[PDB]
Ligand SMILES: Nc1ncnc2c1ncn2[C@@H]1O[C@H](COP(=O)(O)OP(=O)(O)OP(=O)(O)O)[C@@H](O)[C@H]1O
Ligand SMILES: Nc1ncnc2c1ncn2[C@@H]1O[C@H](COP(=O)(O)OP(=O)(O)OP(=O)(O)O)[C@@H](O)[C@H]1O
Ligand SMILES: Cn1c(=O)c2c(ncn2C)n(C)c1=O
């Protein structure tokens with residue numbers, strides 16, 4: 178996480194670059210795991226956020242019963258959706274997809 | 285605990301016995317056409333297990349139907365009961381309909397949801413139990429006494445869930461999909477009682493090959509001009525029947541040559557069913573099943589009558605009925621097309637897509653793979669829920685508070701980080 | 707599937723309105739055979755054009771007249787117009 | 803032609819108003835933007 182944050186929040190180096198490519202199979206072992214997103218952290222500028230993706234959830238979300246619900250939700254959004262509700266329905270989808278992720282995880 | 289193991293097996297294995305039930309009903313009605321008439325009976329062609337394996341496969345079909353609906357009872361029923369609890373609670377909090385609204389005679393769904401607040405275990409999934417006391421003590425001061433009232437209030441005799449379970453049955457029985465599969469079960473039972481109409485289970489091709497939402501697709505694009513247009517066609521044929529009945533009281537002969545006890549169209553009622561059943565299903569027009577106009581002083585009128593009127597009817601009206609129905613399919617295919625294309629050129633979150641984002645090789649591919657990916661928001665919410673409320677970082681707790689506040693402007697609208705650089 | 711459903715219904719009720727012979731003085735032909743009924747409805751009613759209301763008994767004087775008129779009219783213009791027209795539409799749109 | 807004119811009355815009315823005549827492109831960025839335009843700003847009966 179730290180090395181990715183260095184290399185991404187400061188690219189265009191000469192200093193880091195030799196160290197950057199030096200011994201990184203960790204990066205190979207940890208690019209199924211780091212999740213990167215983008216937000217606006219009240220400073221009115223886009224600030225990428227790095228975090229953990231649980232190993233009991235890539236299997237839980239790439240399997241069916243949920244992969245089924247994904248396309249249905251994408252269809253109901255892009256089919257018809259106003260320019261404001263987009264995200265509120267998206268987070269409703271997020272919350273009950275958590276609920277289904279939970280009760281499919283107990284199976 | 286074997287019942288726990290069994291229901292978890294059915295819920296993990298649910299999307300395969302749909303295919304199995306379709307295959308079984310398909311293979312049964314492959315056989316069911318082998319009948320004749322003696323009272324109805326089945327012949328024997330090649331291999332003498334026709335009757336017993338029909339008996340076996342009807343048994344197996346009905347078992348897999350009941351099997352499947354119990355598997356669906358243990359599956360998505362919590363998801364929809366969850367969504368309904370979430371909607372009820374998040375309209376008690378930010379709106380409080382049972383404080384102020386007491387909603388109108390339409391939208392009876394919330395009116396049925398009125399029957400669930402005085403249970404014991406109201407928000408029983410909802411990831412939660414808490415918001416009941418929060419709402420009914422945040423509003424329970426200048427609407428005090430009644431809400432403070434309605435907040436608190438083997439050997440098992442009456443110590444199970446009563447009103448919530450009745451409400452749950454009420455919400456389950458208003459489903460599309462559950463009611464569909466329950467009708468499918470009852471048709472399995474009555475087709476087990478009478479194997480003639482057992483073939484109604486080829487209607488489950490409505491969820492056929494790569495067309496999983498065809499019920500919503502067919503419900504959506506109903507134009508309802510078509511009902512008004514069929515009404516127009518009926519009015520034109522009825523006007524015609526008025527005219528032909530009120531003048532042409534001899535040119536109809538259902539018999540042959542009049543030596544037989546001839547049949548001249550007279551009954552108005554029949555004259556109308558005749559013109560529908562015959563002239564619409566003619567194709568060549570009503571100028572076929574008619575007296576020939578040779579040698580009559582209404583010959584000119586009847587030729588003008590027939591030619592103009594019924595090519596004006598059948599060509600124009602039946603062609604535009606056909607045009608409405610085919611254009612419905614055209615709208616189906618157009619929306620199925622401009623979901624996929626503008627999703628695959630311009631994403632959700634950026635909402636600008638590969639124009640100034642275009643110049644990077646594999647550009648939009650890298651956008652949706654690394655940058656946002658729409659599950660990293662979901663996995664992010666897993667992460668940002670499952671930690672403690674003291675170990676967030678700055679941005680992390682900030683996003684948590686904006687989520688709890690329901691503000692929704694921390695998603696980057698109109699610009700992303702790669703475009704921000706310049 | 708729609709024609710097979712139809713054959714199920716017509717076979718299971720209308721066990722007299724089919725006559726391939728002429729007037730019944732000839733040794734008349736009702737098509738009771740389910741197998742034949744289905745090939746009959748394909749080969750005849752689809753290749754009809756005018757619909758299956760042609761090669762049929764006339765409904766004059768029977769207590770299933772209303773049912774058979776509703777049956778024939780609604781069902782087979784619903785079949786031939788819509789289904790055959792959109793088959794034609796798919797093939798022409800391929801050229802498009 | 804009937805259905806096309808009945809369609810592009812409604813759609814381009816509901817994206818670009820009378821009075822502005824540019825609509826929700828640089829007016830777009832406000833949430834409920836064009837809605838607020840036709841509700842508050844001009845509303846075509848406030849002229850009347
Ligand atoms: N913001 C976004 N969120 C989600 N998906 C996006 C976004 N932007 C683009 N996409 C597209 O979503 C597609 C997902 O790929 P694909 O559909 O092959 O897998 P899938 O979604 O698992 O499959 P299915 O849709 O059949 O479930 C990608 O091609 C990508 O172009
Ligand atoms: N400059 C404008 N003047 C008038 N109406 C406008 C203007 N710009 C946009 N509109 C649109 O007019 C619509 C009026 O809303 P709506 O049609 O639902 O009510 P209405 O006009 O009373 O209904 P109806 O058209 O059936 O009488 C709004 O959706 C708005 O988008
Ligand atoms: C336990 N829990 C929560 O506590 C929660 C939540 N969403 C918000 N909160 C607050 N989810 C999905 C959740 O499972």
Ligand SMILES: [Ca+2]
Nearest residue numbers: 673674675676
């Ligand atoms: Ca701390």
Ligand SMILES: [Zn+2]
Nearest residue numbers: 631633634635
């Ligand atoms: Zn984006």
Ligand SMILES: [Zn+2]
Nearest residue numbers: 819821822823
């Ligand atoms: Zn304006």
